[PDB]
Amino acid sequence: TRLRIAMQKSGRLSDDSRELLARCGIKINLHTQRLIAMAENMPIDILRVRDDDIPGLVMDGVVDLGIIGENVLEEELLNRRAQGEDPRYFTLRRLDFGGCRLSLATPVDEAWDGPLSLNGKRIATSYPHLLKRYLDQKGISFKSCLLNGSVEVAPRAGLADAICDLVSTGATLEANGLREVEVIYRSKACLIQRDGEMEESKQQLIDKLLTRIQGVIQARESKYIMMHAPTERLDEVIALLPGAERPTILPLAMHMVSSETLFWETMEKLKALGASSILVLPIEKMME
Amino acid sequence: TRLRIAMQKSGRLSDDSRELLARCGIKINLHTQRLIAMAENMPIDILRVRDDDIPGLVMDGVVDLGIIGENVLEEELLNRRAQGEDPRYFTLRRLDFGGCRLSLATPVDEAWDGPLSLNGKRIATSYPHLLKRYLDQKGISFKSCLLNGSVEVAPRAGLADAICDLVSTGATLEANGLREVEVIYRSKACLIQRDGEMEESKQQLIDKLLTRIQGVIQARESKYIMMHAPTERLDEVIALLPGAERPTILPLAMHMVSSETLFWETMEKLKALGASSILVLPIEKMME
Amino acid sequence: TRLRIAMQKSGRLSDDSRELLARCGIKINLHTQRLIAMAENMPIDILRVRDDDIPGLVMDGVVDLGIIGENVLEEELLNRRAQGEDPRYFTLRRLDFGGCRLSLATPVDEAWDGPLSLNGKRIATSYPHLLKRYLDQKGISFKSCLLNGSVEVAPRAGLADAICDLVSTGATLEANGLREVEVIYRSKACLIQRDGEMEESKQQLIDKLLTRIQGVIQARESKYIMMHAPTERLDEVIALLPGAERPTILPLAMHMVSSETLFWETMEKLKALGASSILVLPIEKMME
Amino acid sequence: TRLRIAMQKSGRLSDDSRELLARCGIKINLHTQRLIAMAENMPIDILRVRDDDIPGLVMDGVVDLGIIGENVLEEELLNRRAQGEDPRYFTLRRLDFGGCRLSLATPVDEAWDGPLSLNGKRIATSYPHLLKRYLDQKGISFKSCLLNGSVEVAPRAGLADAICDLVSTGATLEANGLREVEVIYRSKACLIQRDGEMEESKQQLIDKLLTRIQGVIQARESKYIMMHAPTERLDEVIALLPGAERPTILPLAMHMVSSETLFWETMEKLKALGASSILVLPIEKMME
Amino acid sequence: TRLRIAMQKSGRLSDDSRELLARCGIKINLHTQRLIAMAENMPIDILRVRDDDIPGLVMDGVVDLGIIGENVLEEELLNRRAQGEDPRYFTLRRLDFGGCRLSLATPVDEAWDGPLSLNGKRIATSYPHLLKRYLDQKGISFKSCLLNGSVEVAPRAGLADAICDLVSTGATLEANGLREVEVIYRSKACLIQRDGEMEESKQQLIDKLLTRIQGVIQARESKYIMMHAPTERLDEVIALLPGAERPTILPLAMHMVSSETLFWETMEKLKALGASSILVLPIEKMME
Amino acid sequence: TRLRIAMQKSGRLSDDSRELLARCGIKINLHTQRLIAMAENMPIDILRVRDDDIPGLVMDGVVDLGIIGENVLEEELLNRRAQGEDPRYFTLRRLDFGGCRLSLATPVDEAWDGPLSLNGKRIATSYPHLLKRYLDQKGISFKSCLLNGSVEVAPRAGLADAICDLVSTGATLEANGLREVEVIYRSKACLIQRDGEMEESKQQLIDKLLTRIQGVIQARESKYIMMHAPTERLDEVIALLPGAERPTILPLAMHMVSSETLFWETMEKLKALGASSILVLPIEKMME
Ligand SMILES: N=c1c2ncn([C@H]3O[C@H](COP(=O)(O)OP(=O)(O)OP(=O)(O)O)[C@H](O)[C@H]3O)c2ncn1[C@@H]1O[C@H](COP(=O)(O)O)[C@@H](O)[C@H]1O
Ligand SMILES: N=c1c2ncn([C@H]3O[C@H](COP(=O)(O)OP(=O)(O)OP(=O)(O)O)[C@H](O)[C@H]3O)c2ncn1[C@@H]1O[C@H](COP(=O)(O)O)[C@@H](O)[C@H]1O
Ligand SMILES: N=c1c2ncn([C@H]3O[C@H](COP(=O)(O)OP(=O)(O)OP(=O)(O)O)[C@H](O)[C@H]3O)c2ncn1[C@@H]1O[C@H](COP(=O)(O)O)[C@@H](O)[C@H]1O
Ligand SMILES: N=c1c2ncn([C@H]3O[C@H](COP(=O)(O)OP(=O)(O)OP(=O)(O)O)[C@H](O)[C@H]3O)c2ncn1[C@@H]1O[C@H](COP(=O)(O)O)[C@@H](O)[C@H]1O
Ligand SMILES: N=c1c2ncn([C@H]3O[C@H](COP(=O)(O)OP(=O)(O)OP(=O)(O)O)[C@H](O)[C@H]3O)c2ncn1[C@@H]1O[C@H](COP(=O)(O)O)[C@@H](O)[C@H]1O
Ligand SMILES: N=c1c2ncn([C@H]3O[C@H](COP(=O)(O)OP(=O)(O)OP(=O)(O)O)[C@H](O)[C@H]3O)c2ncn1[C@@H]1O[C@H](COP(=O)(O)O)[C@@H](O)[C@H]1O
Description:
Chain A is an alpha/beta fold and 288 residues long. Helix content of chain A is 28%, strand content 26%. The first copy, chain A, has helices at residues 14-23, 54-60, 70-83, 128-137, 171-175, 200-221, 235-240, 264-271, and strands spanning 3-8, 36-38, 44-49, 65-69, 89-94, 100-107, 122-125, 143-146, 162-167, 178-187, 189-194, 223-226, 256-258, 279-281, 285-286.
């Protein structure tokens, strides 16, 4: 009828998802107890749902679009495949937020010599399927011990030999006698489309929105760079700076949009390569 | 080795569970990122875990004691029974907190004539097993639609004909075009014991702790009551006031501990029955 | 149709008004964006409105009951009387909360010799009518300068010679070069009834509710007192302790409910009058 | 003596007004209980007052400058005109903040066919004069029902047939069985000057400050734009981009300051018109 | 001139000190940026100062009364004694709040066999004098390493072999590879009087206030106890219950004020000694 | 072993210090109860300590680098010099944050005619050494009265004739009957290096980090400026705009990085000097 996008009502991803669509010029109020939100201008419905529920909402065709993190998505996918189904979706694109990593962590007072060493041990996790996929590929077998939270109790509680969990600061692990030891999966939010024939009108809108998304992400990653054309050694410049648009050379200088960040290392390289008054300006919005 | 109690790390029940054990004189710090907490005095470990994980922790024998709400507990129990297992636990006792009710709610603009009317409709819930038990008993069949949150989207989103959800204020339902319509399950926290032979020493401690629990709950429900012995009509008094301990009559008056509350209705009854200067004093701690 | 009580949606008085009715056993949810709240049990509607709007809501008969502070109430009353109307209401009773005082305050660096001295000066206030009533009675005339807030700018800003404002801690006045100097009106919340013939059924409910109110207030002001009957000098005791219910004397002692507080002065009087082990116990609920 | 600006002590507008003057380089501390604030550098006094009080403060000449929202301003103006006065002020300029709209809203379950349909109905509002002006112009008459808050009770409470209120998200209306239906007044903060001969010295300062204001607003609305001069179709570019300053064309490109925003529609137009690597950079401060 | 009491402006002790004097019926506003507060009724000044500054304020006679914790007090006392002075104060009384303990803590991975073992090691602390007093008495010498905060870095940073710090939950220590190992000083707030001849009038007030203090503390520690006189074994009761006031025996029972708490152990003792329906009621205020 | 930087665990400076090193690309988690933090990438330890403790940590060689405010640093330096030591450190550089000023303030109701007038008066402060240095240079003598906080009580309490304190808004002073009267010391955070031979490897890192620091500070102070080359009067432009990099002149215009801010005065000067469409763009990162 109109476009149905499903997003996390409340958590890690909901702020960034309200923002993405706001930056794509979607006027809708989310500060409301209401869970399906009609859009003001564009023919769009935002279902505010549990992150957990999004993969399935899309897999089942009950909504058209979903912003969900890869891990939650992939885990449910593997889950159903394991019940014997064949759930199907399109990944429109990987988003620029919701980063996190799933990791093997083990007791601190024990030396770690590779995943092999976990063969036949007991691993407590909330991601049994992501974990199983990983050790399977690696030929390692293990006994799963599932917990939906506080996974870091397992070892010190006699429940498991190691855990596999979401990490970022590393704080909890330490607090719990654990240390990261191998990242097994890195995830970000991504934008997925439902399976099956999608009507010309809402497809055109999916397509429109998508182009805004690329633009919003491009603008916040890309940057405007202004250096000093040390004329001779000029080729060795453009290399460290994957341009895509093409430099602009000036008599008096350089000016180009750089899709990656100027990491300090990359700046130092230009330095001791002979470039000067290097600048980097913010870009607020961009088409391209 | 020592007593293992499992409680909700963080949510609806964790404050009341920290408090119960505090009021039973269990010194342990919970303001710590650590998830298994050693007790200072008593030989006790508090595992701070996901509510979801507690029934199973107990069912599996991985801990000795669990404070968990009935619904979460019962739902997992029915779940495993449905996978064909026979998970076993003792209910030591139903606690005085964590009250909530699971309810059928349906769109506001539709008249409701009993659960029968749901036969063959689609009901969205997080408690498929509690719901299924209920309609099964009632001979009604239905198609389940499961969601782990924001269950109140279902109807207005075309996902279901009605939902079955946790309610208290009724706020969300309204916000979402729904109205409560039949409570199907009322729950409170309760205290459960693991199956199998329990060592004499920790049994003695379970037993000790339990007696404190009764005392803490008794003291906060029970009350000390002081009226005026309208001598003639004296029997019609003790009736509305289930005493258990026995009144105390005085020349000058009444004095007794009342296990229930003095609800206004009960006070008015004594009034127009001829009793005066009715008082009710708090009891802070009690044995009995 | 059913009972309409009007209370402050949000501010100084709304917490205490939610509490009063809660303590009278009125189950209704206020944590809702909804402004007219149906009651669960009792046939009652709570309109959640602006304090400012309550006197008029009652004066006009648009609701049946109102919890409003005296000053806001009285000021609007004087206001309409001044437009020539004759607005009419019943004061059911003065409540035990929302205390505050309206005061004359004047610059700190000026000595104050009575209200007389304000004759013909300019006074800035939000309560022009309460102020006018007061100086009128006192035969003093003055020029009003009205402001709906930040009334304490007036003097230091050249707008007035003194202000008349709500005070409690006295903080703002100081911050603004002012000092209290005469309280002209003390107010509390009170409970008012609409004018005109009130149906037998809702009157009976007004009457019921009222009795609960007296009880709730009595219980939180009154107290249970236990001393030592210094037998000889026994009359000089009951005096400082306005009993209302009558002492109870015991061989071994005293026991009675005291409607006022035991202020330290009153305790010291009993002390150096020869009484010992004086106690004061809380009363949680009372009929009487 | 020195410049007196009156601003909202606390609310919707005070943050933006502290910011405007801060961005104009007015050093003054507002984190103080004090309500008239002397400026450090510039000969300026900030009176921190009730928004309600600002129109009159200016209308009366008691201060020189006021930042106040249009609606509050206009309503008081109409108010006095209705008491027969002729209050006078200069609008220096409409500011870039404090946006909001006053709207007719009516019950959801009733179809709406224009303001005409309100003839002789009862409308509850806090803006009786703004409402009256509007229906008057439209030849519609109605009966006013005034409330200073919680205006959205009126209909569901039997007080009015419709309300006229400040709206933004639309949240409350829904919560209260209402829907927006016609905006009757859009407002922003604006900066007003007192009537009467204004001394050369403070006029020069009003004038100075004003120029800063234009600059601060310009910089946060205007933007720096960098495209690719698709040489042939070059005129069709500058059109969608009201420049004011004049484009800058470069051999290798475009560079100009655009006073409006690049709305997505405007970007898409340039796109399918043949422009590429469109950029938009922030401007922090500008003169011009 | 009038009574000068010095208390902690802001921290661990200021809430309890505002409360003590409030419960003694001292009306004074502390919610003010002002640091010397005049009392409304009683001829009293509250200086709101740094805890650190209180011992000296009293030692020097610059104020009359001080609420300060023992450790801060004692440490400064030892400090001056060590500079060769002879600072003098009266301890009026030890208060019922501000408890905390100073402790030796050492790395977790090292076994601890008494303070002796610290001879000649380096101990980091904020309480060098309290620490020095303690090891001196114990005949142990050591090298001090002083830090005013984050004392728990010392060991893991190579700064010291152990630390001596304020502990309560034990949280930080763990977080920092440390474990408590010996408490060397327990402190509470106390109330101290300045040295030298104290005028009859303010002495009388110190004396008055003091009596209120005892009463406030008594009431919150003491409790009202109601059991069942198991007639025969009646002496073995009063023992576990240090009465001070004397039991009261009744035909039908016991009733007395108990200055200590009914710890669970003490309740269990009465239980298996044959007492029943044990109650404990709060006491809000008491003289005695 | 690896680089040891000491920073304020918690206060005025810790946010800016977490940020500086974050902006220098130092990945380390500070949201941890742990006080010595290992760095992820770079061979670096962050000791999170008391600001008070930093000067000494560096002076003693116990750490290598310290971010500390000048006043705290200088005061401790003078302190030890006064105990007869000769503590030694290198100032690498003054940072762009933590600004504050120490000031003489005296009672409001007293006219101030220079520091001379303080000769032989009593001054209460937390910075006795900074104060003593200042009056010493000025040949004024005085009697110190030391307090570690709430220094603004001193005068109104009879403790001193004036105080010397940290000021910013000026709020407290007013609240306490005081007014600033002479700033005696302005401070910012700065970055200091430990004395003695610093190993080639960590020196190289100090050097690296330092260059990042200059860059981070440069980028947030410096700005990109775009005007209109009013060709004739072109020299009078570059003057008000200390360029350092050199302007860039364009046929059609100006473009340069300006290390200072464009203060309004400086913008107005260009204005009435004939420059137009002045812009100032943010710079996010820069080398140079
Ligand atoms: N560190 C994270 C963390 N980082 C990112 N996220 C994300 O949560 C996602 C991945 O898990 P899911 O979305 O599948 O979670 P879920 O099953 O829906 O859980 P609910 O939202 O339904 O509770 C994202 O896609 C994330 O944004 C995290 N979720 C949880 N944690 C945890 O926080 C912990 C420790 O953090 P540190 O101590 O700081 O390292 C852990 O114990 C964690 O479990
Ligand atoms: N109203 C409740 C509510 N009341 C009580 N509780 C409880 O949550 C419990 C029952 O669900 P579970 O414990 O099984 O929850 P769970 O599966 O562990 O969920 P997580 O804690 O793992 O997220 C308890 O035992 C409760 O204390 C509630 N949990 C959720 N809600 C919800 O809040 C909603 C609406 O409330 P009102 O609008 O105010 O009526 C809903 O939409 C709800 O889902
Ligand atoms: N001190 C009070 C204060 N004390 C009590 N109340 C009450 O506000 C009431 C009396 O004014 P109204 O109810 O008529 O107020 P109103 O016109 O409805 O104002 P709104 O709620 O509509 O904004 C009550 O009945 C109170 O509970 C107060 N309302 C305002 N103040 C003010 O707080 C100030 C200063 O307090 P101190 O510095 O701490 O003394 C002032 O400047 C005041 O105006
Ligand atoms: N939505 C608004 C709203 N939007 C903007 N403002 C503004 O308040 C102004 C217009 O009213 P006034 O300034 O005249 O208010 P006032 O009479 O001084 O009221 P006080 O500040 O004195 O309380 C501005 O100029 C605004 O910034 C608002 N003020 C109130 N509301 C209300 O918030 C409601 C609902 O919001 P939504 O549910 O999110 O749409 C309502 O019920 C409203 O009354
Ligand atoms: N645990 C405490 C603690 N407990 C009580 N207090 C008290 O602080 C007092 C004793 O130190 P002082 O008063 O001498 O402190 P001070 O020198 O004035 O310090 P400032 O107030 O001037 O900062 C009291 O008398 C207390 O109330 C504490 N002060 C500090 N801590 C610390 O909190 C830490 C760890 O707590 P846990 O991890 O929960 O055990 C430590 O690292 C501590 O330093
Ligand atoms: N105004 C300040 C203030 N401004 C900046 N800072 C800083 O605190 C520093 C200077 O003092 P120190 O660092 O030596 O402080 P310290 O001895 O370590 O004190 P602790 O952190 O150990 O408590 C910095 O270098 C600052 O960032 C301030 N510290 C305290 N104040 C005070 O806040 C007051 C009043 O502020 P206004 O009323 O707004 O002017 C005072 O009474 C002050 O004492």
